[PDB]
Design an enzyme around this catalytic site. Structure first.
Site, short mmCIF file in Angstrom:
data_model
loop_
_atom_site.label_atom_id
_atom_site.label_comp_id
_atom_site.label_asym_id
_atom_site.label_seq_id
_atom_site.Cartn_x
_atom_site.Cartn_y
_atom_site.Cartn_z
CB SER A 58 -1.04 -0.04 1.12
OG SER A 58 -0.42 -0.18 2.39
CE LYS A 90 7.49 -7.51 3.98
NZ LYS A 90 8.96 -7.14 3.92
CB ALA A 133 8.98 9.97 -1.64
CG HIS A 179 20.21 8.58 -3.33
ND1 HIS A 179 20.80 9.81 -3.15
CD2 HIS A 179 18.93 8.82 -3.69
CE1 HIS A 179 19.91 10.76 -3.38
NE2 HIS A 179 18.77 10.18 -3.73
NE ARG A 183 19.50 9.97 -7.87
CZ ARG A 183 18.26 9.78 -7.52
NH1 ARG A 183 17.70 8.57 -7.72
NH2 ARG A 183 17.56 10.78 -6.99
CD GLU A 231 12.14 0.35 -5.51
OE1 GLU A 231 11.51 1.26 -4.94
OE2 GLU A 231 13.36 0.08 -5.24
#
Ligand SMILES: Cc1cc2nc3c(=O)[nH]c(=O)nc-3n(C[C@H](O)[C@H](O)[C@H](O)COP(=O)(O)OP(=O)(O)OC[C@H]3O[C@@H](n4cnc5c(N)ncnc54)[C@H](O)[C@@H]3O)c2cc1C
Ligand SMILES: [Cl-]
Ligand code: NA
Length: 529
Positions: free
Chosen positions: A12, A34, A45, A240, A286, A371
């Site tokens: 979710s 979970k 984010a 990152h 990146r 993702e």
């Protein structure tokens, strides 16, 4: 019965909740989580979502960027497809209650303030200060809880998909539900449905250092594989480049938006090293920046490098980076006055379960968006703010394909229960915990920023020990979080390494000493069960 619905959504965050809403007015939906409903990467984010809103930008420009940042193997249909739909999808978020930062001032009238980050060529990232995710998650969640046809089950961990041909149902292979560890009541319940959607997030947590919450264990991917799905590009895991290097920053990212608004990346001595690497500097893609910082660390033997937006007005800074400022202050760092120590960390899974334009996997009845999936959009390397974007578009397309299919769906038949295994062993359980640490460490070393064939063999090898090992000591263990997470990390590590071993070249986030050069014709790496 136990549990029945029309569509089951595992996860979710942006992908699942936003899919939920689209399907809610006309379908019965169960969303699993979970942990609490909001812990997922989406909540954390920062930077914002990419779209194209300025008259000066163009979709075309957004495509190109992506194709570039992706190092040559993105899939154009997907990128375009997707580049041409946000805003809409982004607008749709807005229509749902999302507040992105309002400007006040094109030189005449009111607009959405926009940032930029590496690889972008015009201005296009709608955000909420420096905590977009909060705004996003919070809202989607709020609407999903106020919706008669959406049922949210927190702290409920899926264990595996139920595939017809595995439980003697007759017909072609098709998913008909999944077994879920009910954490609060410690049983595995059975859950039926006419469509299941994996929207579990990524797997960055298989690496010792990461920006992600502790959930990102890649369960979705493992589940799919186990169920027969092909997967791809799992060697393309993004580190990152700017995570915080502080003993008390459990795991902490300082958004690329800092660099997007002027921040500099410095050597421990004050110099700016990017120039020695890429004319694009602070704002190059990146895989490149992260490689650069890793290089200068190795070279000078430095614990870290630094990120500094000091040369800037304290007032800008604190209005644009409220959250980061408040949190660095509490560790006694002033984003307003000093360089901040940073290191690269595992952040995003560019690969995952292969899926077409609507999120359809290889297995009937099973979808995957977010993702956890692989669409072709990110090729070898993701461009900042294309990741939340992907979640929305695919939530969209997945809602439209589903709505058309639902009506002609097979009836919700009955299903074998999970064979709750039940053996206990306080000591062995401690070892489960050793193995976790073991995995994460060597992954960092053998499938990390700089790679070699031989190091990859070392990873594979320890991976197989862990699997052989797991089967033998664990097959019969009473399920529990630690154990489920381990089995899944291990499963995924395996595919990450097998994919990394196939690529005889160095591209985007896959850099190997043994093949420095680009092949002329390349593509995704694909594994199928
Ligand atoms: C700190 C940080 C900042 C970022 N900032 C940005 C940004 O500004 N822009 C951007 O585009 N991207 C950003 N990203 C990337 C983007 O956040 C993620 O790619 C995206 O949020 C992933 O969302 P998702 O819906 O696929 O999954 P997630 O939001 O991560 O959620 C996964 C969900 O699946 C549930 N789940 C997982 N496993 C199971 C299971 N076994 N059983 C049941 N449920 C399960 C999880 O509990 C969770 O509910 C950022 C990521 C991080 C970590
Ligand atoms: Cl970011
Ligand atoms: Na992915």
């Amino acid at each position: 019965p136990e549990h029945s619905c029309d569509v089951l959504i595992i996860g979710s965050g942006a992908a699942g909740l936003s899919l939920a809403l689209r399907l809610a007015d006309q379908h019965q939906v169960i969303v699993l989580s979970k942990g609490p409903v909001t812990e997922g990467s989406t909540f954390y984010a920062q930077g914002g979502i990419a779209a194209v809103f300025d008259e000066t930008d163009s979709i075309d420009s957004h495509v190109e960027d992506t194709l570039i940042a992706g190092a040559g193997i993105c899939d154009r249909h997907a990128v375009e497809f997707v580049a041409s739909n946000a805003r809409s999808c982004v607008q749709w978020l807005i229509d749902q209650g999302v507040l992105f930062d309002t400007h006040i001032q094109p030189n005449g009238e009111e607009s959405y303030h926009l940032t930029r980050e590496g690889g972008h060529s015009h201005r296009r990232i709608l955000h909420a200060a420096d905590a977009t995710g909060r705004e996003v998650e919070t809202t989607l969640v709020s609407k999903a809880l106020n919706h008669p046809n959406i049922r949210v089950l927190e702290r409920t961990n899926a264990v595996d998909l139920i595939v017809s041909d595995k439980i003697g149902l007759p017909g072609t292979r098709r998913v008909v539900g999944a077994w879920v560890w009910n954490r609060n009541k410690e049983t595995v319940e059975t859950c039926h449905a006419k469509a299941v959607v994996l929207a579990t997030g990524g797997a960055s947590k298989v690496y010792q250092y990461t920006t992600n919450p502790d959930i990102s264990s890649g369960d979705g991917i493992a589940m799919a594989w186990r169920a027969g799905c092909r997967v791809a590009n799992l060697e393309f895991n993004q580190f990152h480049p700017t995570a915080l290097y502080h003993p008390q920053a459990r795991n902490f990212l300082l958004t690329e938006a800092l660099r997007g608004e002027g921040a500099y990346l410095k050597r421990p001595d004050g110099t700016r090293f990017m120039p020695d690497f890429d004319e694009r500097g602070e704002l190059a893609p990146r895989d490149i920046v992260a490689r650069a910082i890793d290089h200068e660390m190795k070279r000078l033997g430095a614990d870290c490098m630094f990120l500094d937006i000091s040369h800037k007005p304290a007032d800008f800074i604190r209005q644009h980076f409220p959250m980061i400022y408040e949190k660095l202050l509490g560790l006694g760092i002033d984003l307003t006055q000093e360089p901040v120590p940073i290191v690269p960390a595992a952040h995003y899974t560019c690969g995952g379960v292969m899926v077409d334009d609507h999120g359809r996997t290889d297995v009937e009845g099973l979808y995957a968006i977010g993702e956890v999936s692989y669409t072709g959009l990110h090729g070898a390397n993701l461009m900042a703010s294309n990741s939340l974007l992907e979640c929305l578009v695919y939530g969209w397309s997945a809602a439209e394909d589903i709505t058309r299919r639902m009506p002609y769906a097979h009836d919700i038949s009955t299903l074998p229960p999970w064979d709750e295994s039940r053996v206990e062993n306080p000591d062995e359980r401690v070892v489960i915990q050793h193995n976790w640490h073991e995995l994460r460490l060597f992954m960092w070393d053998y499938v990390g920023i700089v790679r070699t064939t031989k190091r990859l063999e070392r990873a594979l090898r320890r991976i197989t020990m862990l699997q052989q090992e797991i089967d033998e000591y664990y097959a019969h263990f009473r399920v529990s979080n630690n154990l489920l997470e381990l089995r899944n990390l291990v499963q995924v590590a395996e595919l990450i390494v097998r994919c990394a071993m196939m690529r005889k070249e160095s591209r985007g986030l896959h850099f190997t000493l043994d093949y420095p050069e680009l092949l002329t014709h390349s593509g995704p790496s694909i594994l199928s069960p």
